[PDB]
Amino acid sequence: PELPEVETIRRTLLPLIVGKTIEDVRIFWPNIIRHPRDSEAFAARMIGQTVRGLERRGKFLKFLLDRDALISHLRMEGRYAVASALEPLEPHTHVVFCFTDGSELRYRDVRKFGTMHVYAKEEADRRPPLAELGPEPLSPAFSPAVLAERAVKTKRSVKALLLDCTVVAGFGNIYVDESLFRAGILPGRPAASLSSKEIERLHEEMVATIGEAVMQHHLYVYGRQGNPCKRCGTPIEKTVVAGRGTHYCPRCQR
DNA sequence: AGGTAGACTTGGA
DNA sequence: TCCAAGTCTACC
Ligand SMILES: [Zn+2]
C-alpha cells in the first residue's frame, strides 16, 4: 500500500488492537525479522507487552507497546488482519501476534517482502529503518525550500531525488511519475537543472498527489505506456530512469 | 562520500 | 529468464 493507504490502515487497525496483551508471537519466516537479529529474541521480548498506540512515519507503521516499538513495513503486497485464533490462517501468513483475548494480529504477503524491527521505544527513531527518514510530505516540514536545497546539491535525476526516502518520506515509483507528469517535468531531468519555478510547482503537485489519494484508476502515466495522454492525447512512453521503469508524456513534460 | 549496486521475494509477462 | 515493488547494507 501507498502512504495514504498506510494511514487508513493505521486508523483502522488501532481500535482493533489497542489495549490487547501479547501472549505469543509465532514466526513462520524468520527473515522478515530484521532486529533483533534472532527472530526468537524478537518473539520473546514482545510477550507480556500491551499495545498502547499505532503511529505512521512515511510508509512504516510504528506499533507502540509498553517498553518496545515494533516498526513494520508492508511495502506493496503485505497486509494485516485481526482475527480469531480459532480459525485457519490465510495463505502466506508469516508472522502472528497472539493476544490474551484469543484474537490475533496477522501479517500475510504473497511476496513475503515485508520487514519488521523491534527496539525499546526511545531508540526506534534513531535506528534503522526510521533513522534518516525525510519529512512527512503533507507537513510544513516538507517545503519548496527543502526540496530546492536537496535538488541544487546533487547530480542525480529529479526522479532519483524524489524516490530518496531521506529527501521526503513516502514517494514510490508510482507517485513519483504521477507527480512529475502533473508538474510538467521530465523524470530524466537533472535535479539541479530545475528552475525555482519548477521546484515550487513540483512541491505543489507532490502534495496534491499525496493528499488527494486519501483525506490503476486516476493515473495519468504510470503503466499507461502506448496509451493516449489524458491531457494532450500524445502516446505515453516508458523508459528506464534511476534504474526504474519510468512513464511520462513527451509533450506535457519538459 | 555522495551515489550506485546488491540483497530481499516470487507470481506472472 | 527476468521484471516488480521499497528500503535497507555493501562499497567504488
Ligand atoms: Zn500529455
A158 vs A180: CA distance, rounded Å = 9
Q: What is the CATH number of domain A133-254?
A: 1.10.8.50
State this model's resolution in angstroms: 2.0
Q: What is the C-alpha separation between A160 and A158, in angstroms, rounded?
A: 6
Q: Alpha helix locations (H) across A119-195?
A: 121-124, 144-151, 158-163, 173-183
| Angle (nearest 5°) at CA A65 between A63 and A70 | 40
The C1' atom of C4 and the CA atom of A245 lie apart, in whole Å, by 9
User: What was the experiment behind these coordinates?
Assistant: X-ray
Cell of A242: 534511476
Distance CA A118, CA A234 (A): 49
User: What are the extents of the domains in chain A?
Assistant: 1-132, 133-254
| Catalytic hit among A20, A59, A62, A182 | A59
Question: Within 7 Å: CB of A106 and strand C?
Answer: no
A91 given a catalytic annotation: no
Q: What is the DSSP string of A183-206?
A: HT--TTSBGGG--HHHHHHHHHHH
Catalytic one of A26, A52, A121, A244: A244
Catalytic-residue membership of A1: yes
d(CA A3, CA A18): 22
Strand partners, A115: A73
> What is the CATH architecture of A1-132?
Alpha-Beta Barrel (3.20)
